[PDB]
Structures are given as C-alpha cells and as structure tokens.
C-alpha cells in the first residue's frame, strides 16, 4: 500500500496506506 505524498516539487518520498 504505497501512495503519493498528498506535485510542484520533486523528490518527495512516497507514504504508506
């Protein structure tokens, strides 16, 4: 369960659900 950080930057880690 891997999703986006909740797009105007680059390199943000993904997060768990």
């Amino acid at each position, epitope marked *: 369960c891997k999703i986006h950080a909740r797009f*105007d930057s*680059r390199g943000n880690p993904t997060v768990e659900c």
Partner: antibody, heavy 120, light 111 residues
Framework: QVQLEESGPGLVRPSETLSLSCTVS?????????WGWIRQSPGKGLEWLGS???????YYRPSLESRLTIAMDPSKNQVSLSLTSVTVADSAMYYC?????????????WGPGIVVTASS | QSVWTQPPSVSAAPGQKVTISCSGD????????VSWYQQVPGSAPKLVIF???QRPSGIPARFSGSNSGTTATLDIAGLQRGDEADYYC???????????FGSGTKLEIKR
C-alpha cells in the same frame, strides 16, 4: 495531447555555450508538471540534466549545476537549456520531456531529440 | 548510486517472458516510484510503466512492473518481434537529490 520539439545548433565549439529550446504545444505550461532535459551520448545511456516548473523551482544534475540553466517562458510556450563551457564530452542526443514530479517523477512525452556535437 | 544496476542483455523467443531487474543500494527504492522506458533504436524513449506498476493508456497488459524496495522489475510477457529495444528504469534518488536512470538492458528476440 502534449507536443514537444527541440531546436538549436547541431555543432558547438569547445568552451562556448550550448543553447537549446523546446516548443511545447497543445498543453498548458501553468499546470503542475515540470519541463526538463535528458541526454544520451552515442552508444551509451540516459542522463537527466534537470527540470523547471512555472513557479520557478528548478532541479539540476549535481555534477552539471555550475554550468546548466534550465528555464521556461509559458507565454511563448518554450523551455530552454543553456550549458556553459562545453566540452567534447557534452556531445549527445538532447531530449525535452514533460515530467510529473512529486513522488512520481515519470517522463511522458519525450521530444524526437536533437543531435549535438561539441568539436573544433 | 548515481546509476541503477541493470543486466546488460536478455534474450527470448516470441511468446515467451523476460524479466529485467533494476537495483540500488540497500532499500533506496522503498519510498520512490520507479518508471520504465522502451527505446527502439533510432527513436526517443517511450514510457511503459510508471509509479512502480501502472501502465499508460495504450501500453498492453503484458508489460508489468514491481518494486520490492531493494530491486524493481519489468516483466515483458508474450514477447513480440517489435519488443526489441533497450529498456531503462528510473527513479528519484533521495540520498543524492537527483533523478537517476538505470544502465539499460538490451532485449534480443530469438528466431
């Protein structure tokens, strides 16, 4: 759908500045997407150079950051590359790309590419 | 690493399946989304997988992806002669603060 086309010189002299431009048509540059540049040396792999978004935020390859400027002009519908103090190792195919940033960092679409040789 | 590790080549007959790996240091791919690119010689790269396992519209379901955190994989099933190409993985590297490509894998189709 997004349309990309690179333009610029095919031949640049050592120590001069390489200037490329990319025309972006059929898509708004003020949406939440980066615009960037990738290169590929003959017979070798893909190398990310950097990218820019309409807010002004920019990311560069650490080894090239002193020589590279990537910028955009959303009225003209263009993204630019400027690589100073070129060397023979800068010879490559250069591609413009649309990038979905954040945690995604996917590249779609790509321009057809422009061949650039740095030589005397 | 500044380039992800991929095998130089893979080879199989039409109708068969290949898997192509993409590795970094320890679990550096754990909190990054991996994408894959198909480059047919003479053309620009084309996105085939994004966000580890998703396919763009138009890409067939026989391309699939996974990311275990240590290693990401592209599977190509039901190989067709037009699948011959160089394949590259890519992902943000948070330790370097830079976008990184894999070293590339050439797919040869047998006949």
């Amino acid at each position: 759908q997004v349309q990309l086309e690179e333009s610029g010189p095919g031949l640049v002299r050592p120590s001069e500045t390489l200037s490329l431009s990319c025309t972006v048509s059929g898509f708004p540059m003020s949406e939440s997407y980066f615009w960037g540049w990738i290169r590929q040396s003959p017979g070798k792999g893909l190398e990310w150079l950097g990218s820019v978004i309409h807010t002004g935020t920019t990311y560069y390859r650490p080894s090239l950051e002193s020589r590279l400027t990537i910028a955009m002009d959303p009225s003209k519908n263009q993204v630019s590359l400027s690589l100073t103090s070129v060397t023979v190792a800068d010879s490559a195919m250069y591609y413009c790309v649309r990038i979905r940033g954040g945690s995604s960092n996917w590249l779609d679409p790509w321009g057809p590419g422009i061949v650039v040789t740095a030589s005397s | 690493q500044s380039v992800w590790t991929q095998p130089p080549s893979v080879s199989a007959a039409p109708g068969q399946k290949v898997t192509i790996s993409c590795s970094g240091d320890d679990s550096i791919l754990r909190s990054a989304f991996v994408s894959w690119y198909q480059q047919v010689p003479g053309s620009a790269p084309k996105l085939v997988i994004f966000d580890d396992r998703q396919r763009p519209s138009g890409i067939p379901a026989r391309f699939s992806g996974s990311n275990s955190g240590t290693t990401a994989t592209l599977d190509i099933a039901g190989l067709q002669r037009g699948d011959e190409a160089d394949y590259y993985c890519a992902a943000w590297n948070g330790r370097l603060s830079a976008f990184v490509f894999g070293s590339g894998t050439k797919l040869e189709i047998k006949r």
